[PDB]
Design a binder for these strands. Sequence first.
RNA 1: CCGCACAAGCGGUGGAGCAUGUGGUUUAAUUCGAUGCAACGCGAAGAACCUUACCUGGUCUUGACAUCCACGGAAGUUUUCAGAGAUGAGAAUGUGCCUUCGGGAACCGUGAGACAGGUGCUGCAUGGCUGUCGUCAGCUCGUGUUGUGAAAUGUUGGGUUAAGUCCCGCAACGAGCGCAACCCUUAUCCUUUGUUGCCAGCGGUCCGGCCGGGAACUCAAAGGAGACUGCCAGUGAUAAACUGGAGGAAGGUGGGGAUGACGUCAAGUCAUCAUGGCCCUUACGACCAGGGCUACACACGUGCUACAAUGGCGCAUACAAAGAGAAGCGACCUCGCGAGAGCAAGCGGACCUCAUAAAGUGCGUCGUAGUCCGGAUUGGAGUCUGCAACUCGACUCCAUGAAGUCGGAAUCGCUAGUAAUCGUGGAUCAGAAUGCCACGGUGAAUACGUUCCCGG
Lengths: 224, 127, 82, 211, 151, 114, 99, 100
Amino acid sequence: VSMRDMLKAGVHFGHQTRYWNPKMKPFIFGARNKVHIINLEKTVPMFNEALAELNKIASRKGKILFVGTKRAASEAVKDAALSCDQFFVNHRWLGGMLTNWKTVRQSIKRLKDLETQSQDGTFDKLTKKEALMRTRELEKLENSLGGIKDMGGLPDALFVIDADHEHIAIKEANNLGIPVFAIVDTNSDPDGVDFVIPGNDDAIRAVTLYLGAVAATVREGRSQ
Amino acid sequence: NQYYGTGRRKSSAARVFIKPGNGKIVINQRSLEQYFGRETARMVVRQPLELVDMVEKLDLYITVKGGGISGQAGAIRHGITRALMEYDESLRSELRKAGFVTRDARQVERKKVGLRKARRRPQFSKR
Amino acid sequence: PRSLKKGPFIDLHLLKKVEKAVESGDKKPLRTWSRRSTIFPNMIGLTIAVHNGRQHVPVFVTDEMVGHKLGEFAPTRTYRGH
Amino acid sequence: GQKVHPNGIRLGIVKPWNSTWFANTKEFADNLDSDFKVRQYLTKELAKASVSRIVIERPAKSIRVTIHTARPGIVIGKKGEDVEKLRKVVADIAGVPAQINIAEVRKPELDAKLVADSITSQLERRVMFRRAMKRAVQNAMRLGAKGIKVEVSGRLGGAEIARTEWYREGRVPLHTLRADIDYNTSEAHTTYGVIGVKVWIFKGEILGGMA
Amino acid sequence: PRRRVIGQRKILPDPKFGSELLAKFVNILMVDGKKSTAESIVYSALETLAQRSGKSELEAFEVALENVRPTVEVKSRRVGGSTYQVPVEVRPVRRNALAMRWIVEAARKRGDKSMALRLANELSDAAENKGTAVKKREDVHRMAEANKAFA
Amino acid sequence: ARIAGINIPDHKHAVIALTSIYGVGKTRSKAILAAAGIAEDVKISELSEGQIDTLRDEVAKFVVEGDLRREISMSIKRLMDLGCYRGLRHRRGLPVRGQRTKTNARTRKGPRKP
Amino acid sequence: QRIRIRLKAFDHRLIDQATAEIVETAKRTGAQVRGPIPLPTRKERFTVLISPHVNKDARDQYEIRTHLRLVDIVEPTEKTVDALMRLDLAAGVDVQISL
Amino acid sequence: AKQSMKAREVKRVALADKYFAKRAELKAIISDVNASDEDRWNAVLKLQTLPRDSSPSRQRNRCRQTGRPHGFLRKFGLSRIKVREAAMRGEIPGLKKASW
RNA sequence: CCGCACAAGCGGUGGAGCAUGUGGUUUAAUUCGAUGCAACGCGAAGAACCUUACCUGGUCUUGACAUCCACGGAAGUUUUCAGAGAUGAGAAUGUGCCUUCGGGAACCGUGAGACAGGUGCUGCAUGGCUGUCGUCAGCUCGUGUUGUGAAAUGUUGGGUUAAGUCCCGCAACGAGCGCAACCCUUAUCCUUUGUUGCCAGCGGUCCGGCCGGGAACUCAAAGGAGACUGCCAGUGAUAAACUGGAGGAAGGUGGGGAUGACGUCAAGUCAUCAUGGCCCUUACGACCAGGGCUACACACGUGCUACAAUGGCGCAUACAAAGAGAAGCGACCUCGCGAGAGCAAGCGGACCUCAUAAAGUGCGUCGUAGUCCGGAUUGGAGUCUGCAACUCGACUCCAUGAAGUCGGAAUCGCUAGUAAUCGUGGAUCAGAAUGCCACGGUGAAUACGUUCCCGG
Ligand SMILES: [Mg+2]
Ligand SMILES: [Mg+2]
Ligand SMILES: [Mg+2]
Ligand SMILES: [Mg+2]
Ligand SMILES: [Mg+2]
Ligand SMILES: [Mg+2]
Ligand SMILES: [Mg+2]
Ligand SMILES: [Mg+2]
Ligand SMILES: [Zn+2]
């Protein structure tokens, strides 16, 4: 992504000067209208160097977890993961999702068992109210673990939108040593992101830019 | 032609038959006012037809069994309405809105153990 | 009242004892456990002890008592008040 | 509090009777008491036959008994001579041409009876009850049960007061009627007295009655 | 009724008269469901009302109600530590019930040899602002104003 | 009225005036009336002596009034005097027909005591 | 000429298998059947105290439901009656064969 | 309960047994309308000479399984506790807890 | 925040009488146990004998019953004598059967003890079981993370729910016991099968679905199909959820049952049984008759019936349900005032019988009273059951005609087919139902609410 490509999307935009985090000073161009302005001169090379690492991970058969819980951007992140055959979290991130992997695996097994059972049959044997209730539970499990049913094991890389909002995920990752790739607004604490991208995390246009560029490079890394 | 019915109630059940052209009502080979020793029974059995306003347009051949006179008359009114329906099927709505396709299931309850009745609790002197 | 088709009821060995009274007359007041047998015109003007449950009380038989039973004269529940 | 007996409540729903014969009021009490006596005799003689189920039907005239156990050739002894004189004594106690049948269960770990009975045996072997039930529950569950629950009652360890214990393992739901829960009660007779033991195993839910 | 408020099952208009307050009426006077004997007692009395009061006995019903119908009631609770006789106003159905109870017991207490005679004697009384039903209405419309000190 | 039973019963329906007589119950009343053949609801007033005599006779057939009371008193006197169980109970004022001696026997027991 | 057979059971499934066997043996010989026509089956209630000492309130209610089937064949051949003679059934099934 | 009681009931039964015929004929005779009034008389006398325990009245329906006198299920003759146990393990065929 | 928690209702209790329990009191004995909830028409679903464990008397001691060892005898039957019987003494009758004839089985008796025997105590030695909190919604766990760790998180908060019911926020998430639901039962309809069930159409018919016939209908009883806030709007985090409507036999877990998470209470029971300890053993064992378990200065509970004209009485007449049955139900006939009796069909019963619903209604009568209310209580004479109705059964008839003329304080119970009434049956039972488990008839009133009581 080129600085012009970002700037038109508005990547330079930031939170209010009232709400910023201390470590973000190096990445901040300045202030206008009491608004923090992010410096694309740092943003572009760091994003490119992160894309290099993401391409490397995906080119060694890496499993990638796209992470974002914004109600606006949930579907964008889900489609972003689907466009590169990867795994995602687009709804509320459960505490200890990565650390309590065994519980998620039992939940994944239950979701697989319910969907297989409905295809196999025995719904007629169940009462119609029970069959409807089973369908509702299957739908609820699909809503919760639609993205990670096929992750199989712990992912090899994480992509995070608004790292401050998803702080539990990054704490888990660091506890596991799983690398964190994150779009970091001025209000976030950048310590947890090993490849940090400072940029707007709310705006739909810039978020979609991040996701599309990452997914293009991930498909490229897969293709070899 | 003929239009039957089966009106049910707490303990009665009544077959019903509509043969048009009249208003006479043979019931268990009886006449209504002669069938019952209660008048309100006859009133509540007239109720549905009185609402549809067709008295001497269809005579009735009906047969009620089991239960008490009120449950009887209720099953009667029910089967009446059922016949009215299967004879009109436009007035099914008319009696549903009239509230006569109810099929009342209000029935006695079993006498539960330790209860001097089906629901009444013994006079347990708490003090 | 038991019945009338069966007549009164009186014991075998009680009849033995009463016929001994017959042949003998006034004798040792006979005794029985059977307060249930019926009095008969033979046993008149005599007495008999019958078990109150622990001891046999002697009732001196008279006419008007005939036909009645013995247990109506041999008490078994005693009482002196409180 | 005082809970419902689990096998009684699931009978017919998922559980078959241990006797089937149709009879009438006249030939019923006699019938069932004869059946009691033959059952009890078998219990006492088969203390080692690992009897799990002793079902008895009285067909129209004949009667047949069927025993699900785990000492198959042993219940047979040799050429059924044991079970043959058994057929004689049951025909004589029942006054009926006897029809003995046996069909072992290869999963003694997977009933509620045989396991509790082993437990009581080891109880008179003076083993530690806790370790015993641990052994048993793990053997059974590992073998493939869906859940086991055990309980023993009475002055445990030769106590001076009746300490109870219950232990859970796996999953045993006792309010889902579609489920199958094998259950059994047994006893052990210590010098200190008697100690109750109760055993449940949930083994998945059945779909479509006994079928 | 700690979560929901239920009351009495919806009445049905009497087929014999078409009206409805008669139905709730006979039900208040009804015992164990002695329906026949109970409607015979009320119809026999409205008839002689239709004569001793001229026509409009069905309307003489209301001629009795409005004369006896209560306007005020008292309902005391322990909201702060003790009770107080508070006058208060209620929806028309409750006062329907109260006035009907008043004329149901007015008839029964008098006795007048027979139920039909006793009922007929009071219906007239209530219809003409005299007697005991309107009198017990005076009790409630009288003691209430004196204890209007507070609420 | 001035009938064989000295009592002058209500000038009302025959039987009501009849069972009024001690020793004459509904059975006695209707049976005596059967012989007269008069209506059940005939009052003593409006009825002449021409039938009062007859009914006086029909009740003279039975033993009634004081004579019956004397027979009932005797049927109990000697009963007590034989010292029979029920006789001793009659002497003690007790239910001689085998009822709960413990409670709610106040009928023959009489008043309530602490 | 009729042949009636009452069947008394405890579960209607078993009696249904039995009646199936009956009517099939009937049609083997081409018997002339009048159908199962289930009859009023009998229900026997029983409540007993479950508490050994001083507890009238505690009781448990059970019930026996003898399911009831009837078959009739108006033209029994020999090849009809031989079947019921050579009939094969369970134990809890109860038969009552008659003219 | 006490084995004495059990065996005693057995004896009462067997005794009521072998006098059944005589009891039948004597009941007949004493009940026989227009008996000799002496044949009937000495008949009832001889009847009061038979062992008492030949009557059925001396008997008491006793629990077969326990010997509990009370709570006798004349259908099964079992203690009120035992019939429930037969339902619990499924001994009585076809039986189950009712719910109506 | 909650529950008929109160409230608001509805009918009671507490007055009367009677039944029925308990404790007193008494007994020779009034057998034991149950003891606020959570004893008290208790265990008992049914004590004249039996039951009975209890009194009194009568007796027995390897014994009523169990096993073992001898000795003997077939086993049996039937009768006499005495006893009050238990029992003792007998007399007759049979003296067999399988036998490898040697024995053996069935059993019977005697001895011998090895033993039996216990409802002896100990539910604070226990098993098993049940009552209670409470079908209250809770109770917990795995893993995670949080802290070095006691621990915590979930289980919290905002909503919402019958509900730890649900949802969302969320270092929690996920499971388990629960809750729910799957069960049974009940409400609509469909398929199947239609006799002993049905009679719509038909003809016949003495008019009786009766008789041909009918398979429809009704039921029958197996299948089913159904109700999901599925619909629509109203809301409401757009969330759950909620308001209301429609549809609909049915609507918001349709109706009702079964189902009791934990635990709590040395809750109850060693007199169901089982069982540790002790415990007597010619007896704390056993066997028999009689008694008692039924007493009554009393007390206390629980019920029934009443105090009346919505009633009483007479006459007339309609409508049920659910059951039960062959040492059984038992019609029919006749008789008997009835209680009944005789006669005897039928039926192991969709078939016969019980079994002929009451309240209801129609008509007349009473005309308000200690009454034609009320009926206890005593009299007389039966009836029936069983050996046997004194102690103490049920029941008819005649006769009597207590109190009671609506019951202080206090208090109970009840949210719909409920209450409240009217009858029906069943279990137990020779017989002995106001009780209890059931069934239908009739069918109400009240909820402002949660401020109060009670409890959670
Ligand atoms: Mg014992
Ligand atoms: Mg008896
Ligand atoms: Mg004791
Ligand atoms: Mg539950
Ligand atoms: Mg709580
Ligand atoms: Mg005795
Ligand atoms: Mg007693
Ligand atoms: Mg009267
Ligand atoms: Zn941001």
